[PDB]
Amino acid sequence: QDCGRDFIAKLTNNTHQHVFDDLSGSVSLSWVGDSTGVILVLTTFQVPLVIVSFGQSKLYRSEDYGKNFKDITNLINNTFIRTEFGMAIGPENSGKVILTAEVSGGSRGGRVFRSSDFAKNFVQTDLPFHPLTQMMYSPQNSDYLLALSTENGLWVSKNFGEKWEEIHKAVCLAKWGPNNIIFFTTHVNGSCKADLGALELWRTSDLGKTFKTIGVKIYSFGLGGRFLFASVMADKDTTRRIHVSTDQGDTWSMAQLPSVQEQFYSILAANEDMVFMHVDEPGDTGFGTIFTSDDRGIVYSKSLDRHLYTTTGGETDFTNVTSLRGVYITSTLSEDNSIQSMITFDQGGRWEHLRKPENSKCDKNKNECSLHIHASYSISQKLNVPMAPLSEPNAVGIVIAHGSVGDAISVMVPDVYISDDGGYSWAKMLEGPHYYTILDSGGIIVAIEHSNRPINVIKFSTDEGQCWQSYVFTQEPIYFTGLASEPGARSMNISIWGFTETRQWVSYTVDFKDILERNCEEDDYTTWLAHSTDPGDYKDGCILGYKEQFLRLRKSSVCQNGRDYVVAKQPSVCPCSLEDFLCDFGYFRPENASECVEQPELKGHELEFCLYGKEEHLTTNGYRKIPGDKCQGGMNPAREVKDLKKKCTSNFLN
Amino acid sequence: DCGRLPDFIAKLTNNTHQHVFDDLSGSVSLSWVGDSTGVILVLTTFQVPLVIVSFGQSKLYRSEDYGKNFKDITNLINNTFIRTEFGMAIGPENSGKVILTAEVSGGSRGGRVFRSSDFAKNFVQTDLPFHPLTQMMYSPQNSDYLLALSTENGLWVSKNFGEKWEEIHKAVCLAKWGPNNIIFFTTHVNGSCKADLGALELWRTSDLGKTFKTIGVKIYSFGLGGRFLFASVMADKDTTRRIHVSTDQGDTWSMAQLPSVGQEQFYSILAANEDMVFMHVDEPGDTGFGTIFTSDDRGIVYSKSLDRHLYTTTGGETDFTNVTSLRGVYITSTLSEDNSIQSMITFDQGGRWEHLRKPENSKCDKNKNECSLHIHASYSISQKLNVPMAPLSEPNAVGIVIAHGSVGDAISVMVPDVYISDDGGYSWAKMLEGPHYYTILDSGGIIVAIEHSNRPINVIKFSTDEGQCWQSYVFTQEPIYFTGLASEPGARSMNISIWGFTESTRQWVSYTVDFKDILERNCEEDDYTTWLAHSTDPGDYKDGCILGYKEQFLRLRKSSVCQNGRDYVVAKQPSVCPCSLEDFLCDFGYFRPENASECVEQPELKGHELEFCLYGKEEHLTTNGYRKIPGDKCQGGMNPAREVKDLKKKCTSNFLN
Ligand SMILES: *[C@@H]1O[C@H](CO)[C@@H](O[C@@H]2O[C@H](CO)[C@@H](O[C@@H]3O[C@H](CO)[C@@H](O)[C@H](O)[C@@H]3O)[C@H](O)[C@H]2NC(C)=O)[C@H](O)[C@H]1NC(C)=O
Ligand SMILES: *[C@@H]1O[C@H](CO)[C@@H](O[C@@H]2O[C@H](CO)[C@@H](O[C@@H]3O[C@H](CO)[C@@H](O)[C@H](O)[C@@H]3O)[C@H](O)[C@H]2NC(C)=O)[C@H](O)[C@H]1NC(C)=O
Ligand SMILES: *[C@@H]1O[C@H](CO)[C@@H](O[C@@H]2O[C@H](CO)[C@@H](O)[C@H](O)[C@H]2NC(C)=O)[C@H](O)[C@H]1NC(C)=O
Ligand SMILES: *[C@@H]1O[C@H](CO)[C@@H](O[C@@H]2O[C@H](CO)[C@@H](O)[C@H](O)[C@H]2NC(C)=O)[C@H](O)[C@H]1NC(C)=O
Ligand SMILES: *[C@@H]1O[C@H](CO)[C@@H](O)[C@H](O)[C@H]1NC(C)=O
Ligand SMILES: *[C@@H]1O[C@H](CO)[C@@H](O)[C@H](O)[C@H]1NC(C)=O
Ligand SMILES: *[C@@H]1O[C@H](CO)[C@@H](O)[C@H](O)[C@H]1NC(C)=O
Ligand SMILES: *[C@@H]1O[C@H](CO)[C@@H](O)[C@H](O)[C@H]1NC(C)=O
Ligand SMILES: [Cl-]
Ligand SMILES: [Cl-]
C-alpha cells in the first residue's frame, strides 16, 4: 500500500470522554448550530401515545464542544420525551430547538421547551393540546410552526411555539408549502382511515384565517420540488391517478403516461425541473417502471424498466447522488432475475449498468462480480445494511455506500464502497457493514463497524475516502449507538456515543484539528471532470449541458482544505448530444442503447395526451430536452405538440 | 426462602453438551424433530428477496443423539440455499414429516424441496414445477396433503407428501386448508390481488382441485378459526366492510350482529375455538382502543365483553393472550379512564373481566395506578417495548404462566421483568429482573430462562418447582450472543438446546443441557399440593369451577426438585357445577360495568326493541340480560331466561352470493 501515514498522538490528546451515569431509555445526542460548541444529550422513552406514564427524561448540555456536560434535567422537570419525537431542531442557522414532552403525571396538554439561541437558554410553554406528531418548521420562516394534535386538530404558532391556535379540527395530514402555505387533508363523519379516497385537500395562506378547497376524493397528497401531488380516487373501481399542480393547487392535471391501467403509482423524487415516477407492473410482481416528466410534471416517458420495489411498503433503491448534479442510482431486475445497480448521469435520460470496481479479481458467472449498491430496497428486504448511500453536495463526487457482489455471503454481509466521481467508479474500502458520516465538506469521512460486539475503533479518511486509517479511541469498547458530526462546512469534530453492559452511557468527541493542522496547498489537489456517457473529449465533464472542473485531494493527503471542490469560475456551455434528451412520450431506450425507439404497442397509433382539459397531438423524432439541461448547439431534434379540437378530462378533483 | 442451597452444578456439568459449528453464514435455525427421536436439525438460511436469483449454499447439520454430536449433511442440499422466511416445514406432531423448501443456487425453473417422513433421518430430493411464493402448508387432516402458492399466484396441491404437484387454479391470492382436506382460497380476474381487494371471489374445493364451488364474492379477506369460517365483505356503495360467518364451510353465511349503530368501523377476529368468537371492534376515530365482543356458539350474535381494548393503530395488534394452561382464562390490556394501561383477565371465556391482581410482594406501598402489573403481549411488542417473548403457557403445565410485566414507571416499561403465575394468572410474582427468553418443558417440571441483552451470556436460569425457585447455571466459559432456545418435544422432556455465536465472522455453537440427573428422584405424594382454579363468584360451592366443571389440580411444592410423571389434573371425571353469573355472557345489547358481576342494558338501547338479523330473518330478543357461555356445562342454579322471537320480516344478513 502507498497510503503512508504518528497520527495517534494527534488524536489521543483530542479525544474527549464523558461518562453519563444512571441513564435509562434511549440516549440521543445532537450538535446544535455551527461553531457554537453546543451538544445536547437527551434520554427518551418508548411509550404509546395514548398512555399516561410516570417518567423523567434526562437532559445534558455541553458548551465546550463535548469536553464537559452539565446536567440540566431540572429544566424539563417532571416531563419525559418520547423516542419517536426526540428533538425538533430547526434550520441550520436558525438557533431554534424545541423539546416536545409530556407531563409525568399526565396533563391536558403537552409541554414544549423552546430555545432560540442554539439551546443555551430554554423557556417552558404548555400546549393546549396533545401533539400526535412532532412540530414542523415552516421552510420560509422558522417562527411559524404547525402540529397535529391527538384529536386531529391542526394547530399553528406564529411566534415560535409560545402561542398556539387551532385552525381546523378534522385534519389527517398537514404539510408546509412555500411562502408559509399550509396544505392539509380533512374529512367529516368518520376517521381518516375510514375516509381514504374521500378526503378533501385544503390550502391556507393566512396561517389559518381563510381556506380554499383545492381537491376532493383525495386518497393522499405530497410535495416535491415545485410540484404538488394528489392521488385521487375517480371511479368507484378504486383506481387511483396522480394529479400534479404547479400553482399551489389552483389548477391540476392528471399524469399522462404512455400506454395506459389499474396500476399503482409512486413519486420517487422531484425537484424544480422534473418528477421521477414509479409505476408498478400489473400483477404486483415486485418490479415496475420509472417515468420522467417534462418541466410541468404532466407528460411522462419511460426512463428505466424493471425497477425493483418492495411489495409491502413500496420502497426502492432509488438514490439521489447529491454530491454530483444529475446523478441517480437504483436497482433493477435483469432478465436472468439477478439484481443490478443502474446509474444515470443525465437525470434519467439514459441509464447504464454500474461499473464493476477495479482490483476486484473475481472473474464463475457474468452476473457475479456485479456491484449492487444497497439502499431502501435492501433496507426493506431486511438486508444487513445500516445506512443508505451517503453523499453531500459540498463534498463533490463523494459517495459512501454499502455494496454486495452476486454471492449470498456478500448479501448477508455487505462491504463499504467509496466513489469519488459521483458513482461512475467504485472501490471496496471497508469490510462489513458500517455507520458512516461525511464532514469538513468531504475532508473527513468517518466509519464505525456495525456488529453485535462492542467497538472501540474509528475508521477515518482525510483524502476523500482513498486512504483509511483506524484510530482506537478508547480501551473500553462500547456497544455503538450513535455517530454525529458537528455542523459546518469546515467542521472537524465528531461525537460517538454508546454504552457498556444496567448500562453505562459514554460519549467520545474526537477533534481532527491536529490531524489536519497543515493547510492544503496547490499540490494537494488534482482536477477532474465529471463522467459523460457520450464519447469524445468535447463533452468530457458536461452535466446537463454545463461543464465545470472539479477538485479532488490527492491520494494520501492529510491537510485541511479551505476552498470549494467546484471551481467558482465561469461554467462553459456544452453542445447538445443524445445524453441531453429524455425519450419523448411513447418512446424508450432499450438496454445499453443511446437512441430512443418507439414503444412497440404504440407504433401505427397517433401519440396523444391530455394537457389541462385539452387533447394534444404529439409529433416527434423521439427525444425531448431534459428539464434543466442548458446545452446549446449540436443535436436539435424537433417535436410538435399541436392542439386538437377534442376536450378530455385531465382533472378528477375540484 | 426458595429451597436450601441444593447442589446442581456437577449434575449439569456432565450433562451439558457443546458443539462448535465451523464457517456458518446467514441465520442459524435449530429445531428438534419429533418426541424421543434424538434428532435435531441445524439449518443455515439467507435473507434473499423472492424474485432474485442468488448464488449461495445453505448448510445443514443433523444430530441423532439429542444434540451431543452433529453431522454435516450439507451435501444433501448441495447447490441450494433456503430463505430465512421459509426455514423448515415441520409437519404435525408425531407425523415424522419434514420439508426443506430451497431454491437452486444457479436458478431453476422451479424450487427444490427435500422431503422426509422419518423424522429427518432420511431425505429425498424433489424438484418443483413452480417457484413457491410461501411455505407449503400441511393439511391438518392428512399430513400427506400439501398446498403451496407459486410466485405466479398459482395454487399447487400434492397428494403424496410433495412428490407430485398439480396446479388446480392459476389466479389465487391466498389459500388455506380447512377441515377434511377442504381448500379455501381467494381468486380474481381483474389484474392483481392488491388491486382487487374487495372484489375477490372465495372458492372452496373438497376434491383437491377436481370440482370447485364459489362460496363468496366481493371478498376483501378471509380466515379460519375454530369451527368458524370468516370473510370480510365490501358491501356496495359507501365503503363499509362487514364480517360474515359460516359454520358449514361456506354453504351459508350470516353477517355478524353487533349491538351498535352502523358506524363504519373496522372489525377484527381476536380468537375463535369450537365454541365462540372473540371479536375486536375499533372505536370510531382510530383512537387506539376498541371493544371486545363475544359470540354465541354460531358466531353470529355478539355482545360487549370488554371496553377500551388497546390496539396498535398500524397492524391492529393487541395484548390478547390465551392462557392455554388453564381453560377459560384470557388476558389482555385496556386503557383506563386516567389513560393508564391496565391488564384485564377473564376466567370465564370473556363473560366477565377483572383487573389483574398486583403481586403480593409488591415493589411499592394517579399515584395508585403504579404497582399495577401490565403483562406484555403483542401490543407491547408492536409498540416497540423491550419484550422478547409474549406470555408462554402449555396445556400440559396446568396453571403455569410466564410473561414479561411492567409497573406504571417509564423505567419499568423500558426494562420489563419476568413474572410467574401458577394459578393461570390469578396471582403473579416477580421472579427475574430484566427481559428474558424462556421455555417450558417436562410439562412444567422445568422452566428455563435466558437473559436478553446486548452482552454475550453464559447463564441458564432454571426452575424445577414451576417457577417458584430459580437457580443459575453457567453452561459455558465462553459467553455467546444469544440466538435461540429450543426445548425437546414431549410431556417428559428434559433436554434444552441453546445456540448462539461469539465475536460478531461469527463462530456458532450449540449447548444441549440434560436435566435428567437434576431430576433423578421421582416425585411422590409429599411433593405435590392440590389447588382449585379461581372463580369470580364467591363461596366454596364454585371454587375450582371452570365453565361448569370442577377439577382438582396438582402443583409441586416450593423447592421441589424431583421428576413428576403424572398429570396435573387429579379428578378422573369433573363434577358438574351449578350455574351462576360467571357462567353467562351478557346478552346482545347488554354489558358488564367495571368490577360489576351483573349485566345491564347499554344506555343508548334502553327504550328500543332489541332486534338483529339472523340468516335473513329479523329476530326480536327478550332477555334478562344473560345468555349461557358457549361451551359452559353448568347445570341448575341461576337460570336467567331469554327468548328469540321471529318477527316474520325479511332482512339482509348476507352481502355475498
Ligand atoms: C472542534 O472542537 C474544538 C474543541 O475541542 C473547538 O476548539 C475550540 O474552538 C473555539 C472557537 O474557535 C475556541 O474559542 C475560544 O474562544 C474564546 C472566547 O472568544 C477565546 O478566549 C479562546 O482563546 C478561544 O478562541 C476554543 O478555545 C477551542 N477549544 C480548544 C480546546 O481548542 C473547535 O473550534 C471545533 N472545531 C470546529 C471546526 O468547529
Ligand atoms: C435427553 O438427551 C439424552 C442424551 O443426552 C437422552 O439420553 C438417551 O436416551 C436414549 C433413549 O432413552 C438412549 O438410547 C438408547 O437406545 C438404545 C437402542 O435402542 C437402547 O438399547 C438403550 O437402552 C437406550 O434406550 C440413550 O442411551 C441415552 N443417552 C444418554 C447419554 O443418556 C435422554 O433420553 C433425553 N431425555 C429425554 C427426556 O428425552
Ligand atoms: C438531488 O439532490 C440535489 C442536491 O440535494 C438537488 O439539487 C438541489 O435542488 C434544489 C431545489 O430542489 C436547489 O435549490 C439546489 O441548488 C440544488 N443543489 C444542487 C447541488 O444541484 C436535486 O434537485 C435532487 N434531485 C431531485 C430529483 O430531487
Ligand atoms: C385457548 O387455548 C386452549 C388450548 O390450551 C384451547 O382449548 C382447547 O381447544 C381444543 C380444540 O379447540 C380442544 O381440543 C382442547 O381440549 C381445549 N382445551 C384443552 C387444552 O383441553 C382454547 O380453545 C383456546 N381458545 C381459543 C379462543 O382459541
Ligand atoms: C420539580 O423540581 C423540584 C425540585 O427542583 C421537585 O421538588 C419537584 O418534585 C419537581 N417536579 C415534580 C412535581 O415532580
Ligand atoms: C448490456 O451491456 C452489459 C455489459 O455492460 C451486458 O452484460 C449486457 O448483456 C448487455 N445487454 C444487451 C442487451 O446488449
Ligand atoms: C455439488 O454440485 C455441484 C454442481 O452444482 C458439483 O460441481 C459438486 O461436485 C457437488 N458437490 C457434491 C459433494 O456433490
Ligand atoms: C374497580 O376496582 C378497582 C380496584 O380493584 C378500582 O381501581 C376501580 O376504581 C373500581 N371501579 C370503579 C368504577 O371505581
Ligand atoms: Cl408546491
Ligand atoms: Cl472493535
Author numbering:
A (entry chain A): 51 to 55, 58 to 312, 314 to 416, 420 to 557, 561 to 713
B (entry chain B): 52 to 416, 420 to 558, 561 to 713
The study reports:
Sortilin can trigger internalization of ligands from the cell surface via endocytosis and sorts ligands between several intracellular compartments, such as the trans-Golgi network (TGN), endosomes, lysosomes, and the secretory pathway. Sortilin binds and sorts a broad range of ligands, and dysfunction of sortilin has been linked to a wide range of disorders. In this study, we detail that sortilin undergoes a conformational change within the three luminal domains and dimerizes while transitioning from neutral to acidic pH.
The structures reveal two distinct conformations, a monomer at neutral pH and a dimer at acidic pH. The r.m.s.d. between the s-sortilin chains in the dimers is 0.80 Å for all of the 650 Cα atoms modeled. β-Propeller blades 1, 4, 6, 7, 8, 9, and 10 are involved in dimer formation.
